[PDB]
Structure of Transient receptor potential cation channel subfamily V member 1:
Amino acid sequence: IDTCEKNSVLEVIAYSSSETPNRHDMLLVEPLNRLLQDKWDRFVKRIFYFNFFVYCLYMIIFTAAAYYRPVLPPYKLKNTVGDYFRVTGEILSVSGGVYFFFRGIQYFLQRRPSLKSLFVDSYSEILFFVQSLFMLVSVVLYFSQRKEYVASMVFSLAMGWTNMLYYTRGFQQMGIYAVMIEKMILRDLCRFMFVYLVFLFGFSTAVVTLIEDGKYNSLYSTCLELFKFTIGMGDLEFTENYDFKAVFIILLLAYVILTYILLLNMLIALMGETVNKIAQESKNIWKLQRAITILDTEKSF
Amino acid sequence: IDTCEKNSVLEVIAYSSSETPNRHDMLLVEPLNRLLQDKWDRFVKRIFYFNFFVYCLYMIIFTAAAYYRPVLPPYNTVGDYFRVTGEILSVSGGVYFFFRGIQYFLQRRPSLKSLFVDSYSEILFFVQSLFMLVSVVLYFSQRKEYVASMVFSLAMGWTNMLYYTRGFQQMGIYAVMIEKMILRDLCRFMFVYLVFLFGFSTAVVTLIEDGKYNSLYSTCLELFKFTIGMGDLEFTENYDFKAVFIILLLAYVILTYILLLNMLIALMGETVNKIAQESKNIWKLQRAITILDTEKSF
Amino acid sequence: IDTCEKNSVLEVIAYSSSETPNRHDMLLVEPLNRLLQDKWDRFVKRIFYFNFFVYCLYMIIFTAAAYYRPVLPPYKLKNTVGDYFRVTGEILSVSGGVYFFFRGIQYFLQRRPSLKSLFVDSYSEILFFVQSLFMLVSVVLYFSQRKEYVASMVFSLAMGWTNMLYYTRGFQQMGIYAVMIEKMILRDLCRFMFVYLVFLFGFSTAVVTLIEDGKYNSLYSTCLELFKFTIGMGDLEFTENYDFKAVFIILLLAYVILTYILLLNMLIALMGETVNKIAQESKNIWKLQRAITILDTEKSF
Amino acid sequence: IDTCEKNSVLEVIAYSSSETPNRHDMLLVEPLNRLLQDKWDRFVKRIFYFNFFVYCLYMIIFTAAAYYRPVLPPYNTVGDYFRVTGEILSVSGGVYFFFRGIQYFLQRRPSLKSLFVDSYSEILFFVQSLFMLVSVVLYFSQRKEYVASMVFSLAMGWTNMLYYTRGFQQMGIYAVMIEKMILRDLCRFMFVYLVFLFGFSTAVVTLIEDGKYNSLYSTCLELFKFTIGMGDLEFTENYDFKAVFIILLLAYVILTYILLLNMLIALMGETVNKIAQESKNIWKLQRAITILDTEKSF
Ligand SMILES: CCCCCCCCCCCCCC(=O)OC[C@@H](O)COP(=O)(O)O
Ligand SMILES: CCCCCCCCCCCCCC(=O)OC[C@@H](O)COP(=O)(O)O
Ligand code: NA
Ligand code: NA
């Protein structure tokens, strides 16, 4: 069940592909929970909370190196203690980013997923590989004498900080919150974004055709003006370069009614219904997270 | 049952008017649901995937042609050739939809009553096609309203793509849920909110003596602004009794922005909590009607 | 009525006092529910749709104060078709207001009500009487050579405009929807308004005490600046001349977190769960309101 | 049951730490409930109404003296003499609360764990008293930080009236509901959203090259402003890769405004739909302890 050198119940159930029907109810078994929870309070938490500190320090050094970037590259090293700190910090952030890149490649070679929607499945590792990729593509451009390295560095800085949530596991309520938001993005945000993108683009495509000329005669500008409504900034007077105010006002009011007053509230209702439906489901998938984490550190050491 | 050439239960349950108590639920029996989901997996799903592709390309061509309209119509180079070809193809799609709507009306020959309670999609497409034709005739009639009817036709046409979201279980249910919310909750909210909006706008306009919003339209727009989190609360100072103005503005906000606006969320939540089952059944019926529509086309 | 007149069954159960334990399931009695349903459409509904039209036309005859209001009253007659319309509309509105005043007084005398649960229950007629009182004091202000008549009549117009929601009843969905807005303003909007007022008064008092001098040194100005956060307009830097920024920023963030991020969402959740609990009782109370409304038409026709 | 001067079941329930498995449901029994309600109605209730009146009067006196403070402290007129006596009466109230907190801390002999897990109300009062005392010290110590201390104390004093909402069934349930929501939902949301906001602020500031939005504080405030529905999306233009700037803003907005806040509104709704009995039982415990405390006071 725990150690066999060939195959173990914990290994097959924790590492089981999603195709298994009850992979979330195959771990509540009395001995399996007592063993996994033991392993959680035995080693895996000691390796999960020491590694958490290491990653936090890595992200604090990576944000120190990025913020203090000097203003084409590469650059020289000024004789200053601050410059030395910056140079060691960026060298250490790049090293960590190539370490994550190797960990991801090892994960791909070893587990060998079936090229079947592996983006929703084990999405934590694919995100960590995207961050390592953002760091190593920020390294080659920087040595290639181009300023797109900063665009890449801000994206790697914005990918690491948001992915910090990976360590929310090990804490019951905080893990249940993380898994609940994750599946909510995979469900409520995806559908709402599809329909909202259709309405926003179409209503913004009808305005830009109606508008004659000006700062807002571009499709991008009109889309931005139309989007400003969702964030409580709708102006309703941003342009007067049109022959027909009735046609503009009718279109803008229709867009507001269709999106702001109907879709957002209907989304808040759907999020309430979904939240009321999945307490047990979110506990069982959270139980699958910590359980895999237990075996992951049990194999790391 | 499915091919009898006299009367098919599939057609009887599908083309039944809203009168029938159990037009949605009766289709879930072992034979009807399994026969329709099969028809979807046989010669409807892929016939509906190509049709949607064609309608997406048509909508892209119509947007590209309209987005570049030159500035009293009617109005050589590769760009102008492409623009005129796109305009012609857009007109050709509009007229095709117009004949399709006419054919639907003549065949189904509605009872004069279900055209407003059933198949909102057909009515929505016919109105889009009518806007398109009004935009053609006005364009050839030496008038600039051709661009007003055109932008409305494009705004309605872009919104009509939700008709094709059926064929997908989650997105179809999503569309049916939007349809029901708009029909019930948005209608009630709009009635009660409009009564409030009008009453307090007429009250504020009356308070103002001589200013920039004396016009009822400007003040109505100002009071509507508060609903989208862009309210001013100090838009005017050219009046007397500042206490009366501020009290009137604080009364309105609470009754709508802080009471009826949040009331729309609770009712939406209640409804969504109650209409999952019927929303799935209606999607199934829309899918079954599309299946029998794809079969009768031949 | 179940065969009795002096104290008819449907008369007493409809005109029951507040202290009655279960008045809500009285008119729903199948027989008593078919007394105000077979009679509902008999005549009272025809006299309730005519009265609704008569009140709408009355309201609109006075809602055009934009067109009427001249720029030290009383005023002169301009000898035109517009001024004639204005004066006849004013007279008609003043007469209808007197009519609603005399109706309210005649209700207070005939019913000799408790006038303590008359503001929580049967509060509709209280609002109508308030509308009639504001009209009366508007006429006296206009005749007493004062400019406060414009404020009184503008409050009366808004008071009578909100009251149209009374005649919104008679339709099952709309009346029960107004019943939910009626019971949600009594309980939830009261409790939230009481806790938000204490919070907003306290933080405004702290902010104005911190502010050293400026156009916002007034308590009223700072209170308004603090309130503007609720409607999605918070500036977070409205003042400049105040105590060291160290204290002004922390106070504003605390106010935002406590009021915008916490109490409005708490109000939404509370009105969601309440809406989930109040279907049958909202239908029954709507039935009680129609039973009394049509009983009033039965006694007045 | 009432008092044996060594141990009574009433004091046993009221003074036991939160460690007890079911300290909230013990008062639900008939005898304890009826006896505690009767005691309340008899005297404790009238004793709690006068006590709140005194606090309301006190807060106003201190507030009035603080609002009209003269503008190098420290510092013959009816206003000045009123302002100096109000300050004296405010300093006298702060001292009284200080001594009450010390007495409650020395009597309960807290085990240093439930001190910051329970009696949150007792803790809030001692903190507002400490700021008042440090305000007096600074005032007489020739410093201008007494204003900062006084405004903090004034804010806490105005927000602490929620301690006198107990004694009222609806205002007591609402106040415990707000307590539990702040204890769990607000804290978890704040943790996650602070992580997000720090990440995206550090990404945006690292994208800018120079300007008055180059500092972390201003750019962090700018990113925070989106949550209150007053976002800009065009706050700065002194940088490169406008695509990178707009993508980073649109990702932050999608993550926080349209996903995190609604997520919080759903979780809140769940908890409210779940806590009714616990909130009622905790308010009853706040009321029973109050009756027991009034009996102990004299
Ligand atoms: C490449 C995207 C744009 C880059 C610039 C902006 C930064 C956007 C960051 C998007 C990723 C954040 C969303 C996300 O997916 O977070 C996951 C975290 O919960 C980690 O928890 P877990 O381990 O996966 O359980
Ligand atoms: C004097 C204060 C400002 C006066 C301005 C008048 C407009 C401000 C709002 C007045 C009160 C709003 C509440 C209200 O008027 O609702 C009543 C409706 O439910 C009527 O329906 P119903 O009879 O109760 O069923
Ligand atoms: Na806003
Ligand atoms: Na807003």
Q: What stands out?
A: The two ends of chain B are 18 Å apart (CA to CA). The longest helix of chain B spans residues 169-207. Residues 177-276 of chain B form one domain.
